[PDB]
């Protein structure tokens, strides 16, 4: 549900994916996916 | 003839594509029959390709180990080491014989019906299978699946007698090791086979029109390092070079006539065996397609749509005879998928995630895009590399050839291509394959716990290099 | 000269994970210092463990092939196959020396400061290294990171002299193949080392308190099958037995008293060499932990939290001085993510995905949970298996020993454990681990396209069988 890196890097940024959405193969929340959650924080 | 047979799925050809589609069709509850023209099943993979040449490189490999410096340098010391080629060859065949028995056995288990004979579509729902004693068998069927596979692309002007001038399949049964030997073509097939007889004591020279070794879609960097490694072992190559013709002579020796692919440094190599390895083409001879109005690709292939349907909807085609890579796993895949399709399921296949492997030693395996394809495409990428000289497992076995090259997209760090030159590349490339079907990033794969010490760990270290900029051990 | 230095992180030990954290830390831009007491770097893994033992398992395997029926059945005939232990031992020292050389060199390019000596933590911000000859070296440091590794667990009333009663260390440097060998403990290290000498001519029996060979977490059914195989090779086992003591005889031999663990059907076994390996324990002596108020836990490991910190926040312990598998790949990862956490980031590691591997032949490897871990957890599963006997590359290679067994959660097809007995297992489990980290389900693996012909196909076939009722080739 979370690629290793996706998960690792959510954690480092004290947030989860309940917000942002999934993409990529087996509906696994991508690191691409997380980065976008990441950039939406700053942007915000 | 006698009494017409009744079928849901009639599969023509019994190679890798055909025999799994038949069994899968079976596993799904289809009155399946599979026709194969030859005595044994397994098509070309099993009987004159993959399995033999593999069983042979395996053996030829251990030999060079035992005859060379490897063994003496690790404590194991032999008086003399002779080669018993007939015993070696027998090993290969026992394996093939055993496997081919299996397939037949797999058929009974699933209630697949094996009809022997040279099948041919004689209706939109019928194929006639004719044995050479003139016997015949008609199957009245709901769908027809074609898997007639491929054949050697023959070289015009040079006639293969299968004795001193041979193709893949004659080079697998050489009755003796040739002194000198030339190979027209440095593709996976040629290179592999050449390597076998090289390892055995043959002086082997390959001649290729193109500027690189290994097939198409190989990375030019790993191709060149690859070639270089073979050159060290004793293999000699004559790249960017075409043959004018080759001539048999008084004392047996063959004289091939080479010349620059462009200019003209006309030369003449003289060998004892001439392997012709210039390609392989689809095989549709006498299937009866001309008469059903099915046109071929300009390269001899069958135009099938997305669900593997030909111009005639109930007639499909899959494997070597249809577009895509001419690989065994590739056919098995279309085989299964095509059937699950008849079954009413979805037919997706991702041709980007289909591993390619050359089994010399060292192995070469890759999946996804190469650097050249990524440029031609306009994709911004980065590369991380980890050599086996730095891999522990590798150093510990004194086998330190090659590197693992990973291509990750510069921005999303998505792995776009993995290429392994080195020990255990064939089995490594599947882990890659997996990661790639996941849209892995070089980061993801780096955070996976790979066990120590393994060849694999260098696959991990190359992504670690591509996503952070450098690895720990290199 | 002997004069203070300072650093951001000072790491004690240069085993896996000790030196990898050192390097990692350096590359994130900590001024780091690695202290090591031994004359070489690498820890036990590289000097007396993993590497050296892999060098012999691999060398002695090529013996068992050249000095038996294998080579002969491949058509590699040889006059005499004589062993030269000096030289086989001489290639192992080679590997190790070259490898430890490498670490010294990595430490130079990542600018890691190397301090030789026994390190004591003299204070929350100070480590004191004492050289061979009293010569001292003080380090004032922001963080100190403990990676002092493990040592041999000694056996009640038996003393390792490393000459005739040896531990793993001694074992890797025997001076001739011992005629009869006894091994106390059938864990990993055990079967591993026993198998090396059993292949080289020795007569080994392995006595073990528990009812199964292979360590903890190994799966019952594959343990039984692993045992069965090693038996046919000549490896003799004594399960549910306990060694009550050993006595060293007059002429040179050693007498072990053994006995049923359960009751006590006593009996003696003479032998020329005893290999004592019942376990390893966290090594942590002269570290000054006491005068610091870090208590150890009852098994003697340093209790650390989620970021690997002890009761003292700037003092971290990782590797096998703390809980979790005592494995080299587990040390390395804690080393990596420990420092990454000191540098601000996220520190999560999922110990359910760290593989295990026994490098005998056949190989044994697993990752995730075993039938009995699942069964005592109240978790419903389903099972999928594929014998290498039905695998194309193993059959072609005259290597068909074993099977792959995957466990999937009943209803959610989600892969829970993967277990491999057979050729290439060690590398294959890495694919496994990648699949687990992705929370992949059986079907996900079955869809992935594995190159043909390869061992990995076994791994695909077993998942397919766990997901859909049955596979294709079996
Ligand atoms: C030397 C060599 C090495 C190779 N190594 C590899 C490798 O390592 N990895 C890999 O993936 N691939 C390898 N290949 C290629 C691989 O064999 C092909 O991808 C695979 O054989 C194609 O399988 P298939 O089912 O498409 O066809 P085929 O194996 O070609 O089978 C077609 C079958 O149909 C039969 N047939 C044809 N027409 C009729 C008819 N009209 N009626 C009845 N029967 C018919 C043929 O007799 C044959 O049995 C190698 C090939 C060669 C020769
Ligand atoms: C025979 C054998 C075979 C093995 N095979 C495998 C295998 O195949 N796969 C696998 O994963 N694992 C294997 N292991 C286990 C593996 O070695 C351990 O998991 C690994 O060595 C632990 O690494 P480490 O960094 O925790 O500690 P260690 O390697 O034990 O390193 C600790 C280091 O610290 C030094 N040290 C200790 N105290 C101090 C101090 N106070 N000051 C300075 N230096 C100090 C020691 O000298 C040593 O260098 C094997 C072990 C043995 C012996």
**Cβ separation of B451 and C354 shorter than 8 Å?**
yes
User: Looking at the structure, do residues B113 and B56 belong to the same domain, yes or no?
Assistant: yes
Named by the residue before each, gaps in chain B exceeding 2.5 A from C to N are none
CA angle B383, B385, B390 (to 5 degrees): 165
Q: Give the 3-state secondary structure of residue B238.
A: strand
CA distance C194 to C235: 8
Helix (H, G, I), strand (E, B) or coil at A29: strand
Neighbours of C384 (CB within 10 A): 25
Residue B83: strand pairing partners:
C76
Q: Helix B425-437 and helix B456-466: axis angle, to 10°? A: 50
Helix (H, G, I), strand (E, B) or coil at B258: strand
Active site residue C452: yes
**Sole residue written with tokens 């696994």:** A28
Backbone angles phi, psi at B61, to 5 degrees: -65, -55
DSSP 3-state of B229: helix
Alpha-carbon distance values, B263 to B259, B266, B436 (Å) = 8, 9, 43
Residue B53 to residues B13, B90, C167, Cα–Cα distance (Å):
21, 13, 45
| Beta-strand runs (E) in C37-146 | 76-78, 81-83, 113-116, 118-123, 126-130, 136-146
| Number of domains into which chain C is organized | 3
Q: Strand, helix or coil at C166?
A: strand
User: How many whole angstroms separate alpha carbon C164 and alpha carbon B169?
Assistant: 57
User: Mutate which of A2, A9, A12, A34 to disrupt the C interface (most C C-beta within 10 Å)?
Assistant: A12
B37 labelled ligand-binding: yes
Give chain C's count of helices (H) and strands (E): 14, 24
Structure tokens at C288: 């000054």
Q: CB-hemisphere CA count at 13 Å for B194?
A: 33
- Please indicate if any CB of chain A lies within 8 Å of the CB of B437: yes
Rounded distance between C-alpha atoms, residue B169 and residue B159, angstroms: 15
In three-state secondary structure terms, C356 is strand
Give the number of other Cβ atoms within 10 Å of residue B195's Cβ: 28
Cis peptide before C362 (omega within 30 of 0): yes
Q: Are C367 and C473 members of one domain?
A: yes
Block residue for tokens 């297992």: C425
| DSSP 3-state of B307 | coil
Q: Which residue of A has its CA nearest to C347?
A: A8
| For testing contact with chain C, the best of A22, A25, A26 (most C CBs within 10 A) | A26
Chain centroid to CA B354 = 12
Q: Looking at residue B419, which CATH number applies to its domain?
A: 3.30.390.30
Q: Is B306 in CB contact (< 8 Å) with chain C?
A: no
* Distance, CA of C376 to CA of B389 (rounded, Å): 44
User: Of B320, B350, B380, at which residue does a domain stop?
Assistant: B350
CB B252 within 8 A of CB B165: no
How far is Cα of residue C160 from the mean position of the Cα atoms in its chain?
A: 21
Question: Which of left, alpha, beta for C33 (phi over 0: left; psi -120 to 50: alpha)?
Answer: beta
Dihedral angle computed from the Cα positions of residues C460, C464, C466 and C467, in that order, rounded to the nearest 10 degrees: 140
Instruction: Give A10 to chain C, closest Cα distance, Å.
Output: 9
Q: What is the Cα–Cα distance from C71 to B76, expressed in whole angstroms? A: 13
The reported resolution of this PDB entry, expressed in Å, is 2.6
User: Chain C residue with minimal CA distance to B328?
Assistant: C452
Which chains are adjacent to chain A, needing at least 3 Cβ pairs under 8 Å?
Answer: B, C
Indicate the residue among B278, B299, B332 that finishes a domain.
B278
Q: What angle do CA B57, B60, B62 make, to 5 degrees?
A: 110
Distance CA B58, CA C399 (A): 11
Q: What is the number of other CB atoms lying within 10 angstroms of the CB of residue A2? A: 22
Instruction: Please answer whether residues C364 and C357 qualify as being in contact, where contact means their C-beta atoms are separated by less than 8 angstroms.
Output: yes
Beta-strand relationship, C267-271 and C254-260: antiparallel
Domain harbouring B8, CATH code: 3.50.50.60
B391-409: b or e for each residue (b if 16 or more CB lie within 10 Å)?
bbbbbbbbbbbbbbbbbbb
Taking the Cβ of residue A14 and every Cβ of chain C, the question of whether any pair is shorter than 8 Å is answered with: no
The pairing of beta strand C363-368 with beta strand C203-207: unpaired
Same domain, C285 and C274: no
What DSSP line would sit under C370-430, residue for residue? -HHHHHTTT--EEEEEEEGGG-HHHHHTT----EEEEEEETTT-BEEEEEEEETTHHHHHH
User: Is B306 known to sit in a ligand binding site?
Assistant: no
Is B400 an interface residue toward C (CB < 8 Å)?
no
Q: How many angstroms separate the first and last alpha carbons of chain B?
A: 70
Sign of CA pseudo-dihedral C3, C7, C10, C14: negative
Neighbouring residues of B114: CB distance < 8 A, sequence distance ≥ 6:
B14, B33, B34, B35, B36, B41, B104, B107
Are residues A4 and C437, on separate chains, in Cβ contact within 8 Å? yes
User: Residue B330, SS3?
Assistant: helix
Asked if the Cβ–Cβ distance from A32 to B412 is below 8 Å, we say: yes
Q: State the method.
A: X-ray
Is C410 exposed, middle or buried (CB count within 10 Å of its CB: 0-12, 13-18, 19+)? exposed
Same domain, B158 and B250: yes
φ, ψ of residue C390 in degrees (nearest 5): -85, 10
Cα–Cα distance for residue pair C444/C91, rounded to 1 Å: 43
Which element (helix H / strand E) includes C52? helix C50-66
How is residue B139 written in tokens?
């199957």
Residues B128 and B161 occupy one common structural domain: no
How many Å separate Cα B217 from the centre of its chain?
Answer: 13
Contact C74 B91 (CB under 8 A): yes
Nearest to C335 by CA among C2, C8, C15, C4: C15
Residues with Cβ within 6 A of ligand 2?
A: B 452; C 12-18, 35-38, 43-45, 48-50, 53, 118-119, 147-150, 168, 189, 283, 286-287, 319-320, 326-329, 331, 359
Picking from C44, C137, C427, the residue whose alpha carbon sits closest to that of residue B450 is: C427
Q: Which residues contact C205 (CB under 8 A, 6 or more apart)?
A: C180, C181, C182, C183, C236, C237, C238, C269, C271
Q: Which residue of B has its CA nearest to A8?
A: B447
Distance from C-alpha of B433 to C-alpha of B354, rounded to nearest angstrom:
7
Element (H, E) at B433: helix B425-437
Tokens of C171: 């074992």
Same domain, B121 and B165: no
Helix C50-66 / helix B50-67 crossing angle, nearest 10 deg: 100
All domains of chain A, ordered by start, with CATH?
A: 1-44 (4.10.320.10)
Contacts of A35 in chain B (CB under 8 A): 412
| Residue C419 structural domain | 351-474
Sign of the alpha-carbon dihedral angle for C431, C433, C434, C440:
positive
Of C260, C278, C296, the last residue of a domain is: C278
Q: How many Å lie between the alpha carbon of A3 and the closest alpha carbon of chain C?
A: 6
Q: Is C115 helix (H, G, I), strand (E, B) or coil?
A: strand
Do C1 and C133 sit in the same domain of this protein?
yes
- For C277-300, b/e burial (b = at least 16 CB within 10 A) is bbbbbbbbeebebeebebeeeeee
Please check whether residues B236 and B305 belong to one and the same domain.
no
> Is the CB of B431 inside a 6 Å radius of any atom of ligand 1?
no
Cβ neighbours of A6 in B, within 8 Å: 444
The contacts of residue B123 (CB under 8 Å, 6+ apart) are none
Q: How far is the CA of C153 from the centre of ligand 2 (A)?
A: 13
| B306 and B257 together in one domain | no
Ligand 1 pocket test, pick from B13, B215, B361, B364 with the greatest ligand atom count within 8 Å of Cβ, gives B13
Cβ of B153 under 8 Å from any chain C Cβ? Answer: no
**Any idea which residue has 């947030």 for tokens?**
A15
Q: Which residue has the tokens 């003496």?
A: B72
Alpha helices in C67-167 (DSSP H): 69-73, 85-109
Say yes or no for a CB contact (<8 Å) between A11 and C348.
yes
| Same domain? B85 vs B140 | yes
Contacts of B110 (CB under 8 A, 6+ apart): B23, B26, B27, B32
Tell which atom from ligand 1 comes closest to the C-alpha of B38.
Answer: 47
Closest CA to C243 of C272, C275, C215, C218: C275
Same domain, B175 and B26: no
Claim to verify: residue C358 and residue C447 sit in the same structural domain: yes
Asked if residues C420 and C365 have their Cβ atoms less than 8 Å apart, the reply is yes
Q: Which chain A residue shows the shortest CA-CA distance from C337? A: A8
């Amino acid at each position: 549900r979370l690629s290793p890196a996706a998960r690792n890097i959510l954690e480092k940024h004290s947030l989860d994916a309940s917000q942002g959405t999934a993409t990529g193969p087996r509906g696994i929340f991508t690191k691409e996916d997380a980065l976008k959650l990441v950039q939406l924080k700053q942007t915000g | 003839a006698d009494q017409p047979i009744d079928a849901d799925v009639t599969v023509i050809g019994s190679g890798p594509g055909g025999y799994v589609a038949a069994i899968k069709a079976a596993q799904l509850g289809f009155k399946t029959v599979c026709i194969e023209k030859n005595e044994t099943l397994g098509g070309t993979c099993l009987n004159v390709g993959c399995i033999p040449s593999k069983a042979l490189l395996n053996n030829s490999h251990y030999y060079h180990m035992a005859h060379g410096k490897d063994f003496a340098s690790r404590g194991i010391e032999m008086s003399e080491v002779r080669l018993n080629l007939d015993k070696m060859m027998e090993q290969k065949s026992t394996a093939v014989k055993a496997l081919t028995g299996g397939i037949a056995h797999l058929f009974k288990q699933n209630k697949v019906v094996h009809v022997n004979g040279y099948g041919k579509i004689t209706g939109k729902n019928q194929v006639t299978a004719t044995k050479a004693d003139g016997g015949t068998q008609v199957i009245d069927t709901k769908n027809i699946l074609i898997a007639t596979g491929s054949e050697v692309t023959p070289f015009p002007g040079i006639t293969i007698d299968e004795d001193t001038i041979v193709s893949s399949t004659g080079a697998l049964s050489l009755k003796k090791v040739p002194e000198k030997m030339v190979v027209i073509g440095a593709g996976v097939i040629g290179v592999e086979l050449g390597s076998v007889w090289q390892r055995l004591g043959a002086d082997v020279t390959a001649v290729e029109f193109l500027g690189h070794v290994g097939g198409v879609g190989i990375d030019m960097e790993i191709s060149k390092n690859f070639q270089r490694i073979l050159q060290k072992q004793g293999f000699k190559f004559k790249l960017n070079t075409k043959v004018t013709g080759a001539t048999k002579k008084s004392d047996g020796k063959i004289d091939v006539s080479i010349e620059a692919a462009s200019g003209g440094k006309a030369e003449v190599i003289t060998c004892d065996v001439l392997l012709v390895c210039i390609g392989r083409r689809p095989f549709t001879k006498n299937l009866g397609l001309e008469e059903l109005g099915i046109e071929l690709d300009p390269r001899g292939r069958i135009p099938v749509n997305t669900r593997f349907q030909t111009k005639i909807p109930n007639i499909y085609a899959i494997g070597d005879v249809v577009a895509g890579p001419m690989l065994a796993h590739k056919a098995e895949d279309e085989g299964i998928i095509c059937v699950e399709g008849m079954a009413g399921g979805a037919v997706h296949i991702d041709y980007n995630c289909v591993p390619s492997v050359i089994y010399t030693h060292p192995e070469v395996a890759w999946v996804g895009k190469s650097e050249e394809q990524l440029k031609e495409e306009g994709i911004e990428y980065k590369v991380g590399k980890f050599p086996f000289a730095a891999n522990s497992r590798a150093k510990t076995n004194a086998d330190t050839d090659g590197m693992v090259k990973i291509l990750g997209q510069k921005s999303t760090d998505r792995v776009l291509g993995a290429h392994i030159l080195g020990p255990g590349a064939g089995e490594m490339v599947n882990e890659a394959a997996l990661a790639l079907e996941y849209g892995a990033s070089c980061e993801d794969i780096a955070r996976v716990c790979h066990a120590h010490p393994t060849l694999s760990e260098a696959f991990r270290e190359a992504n670690l290099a591509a996503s952070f900029g450098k690895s720990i051990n290199f």
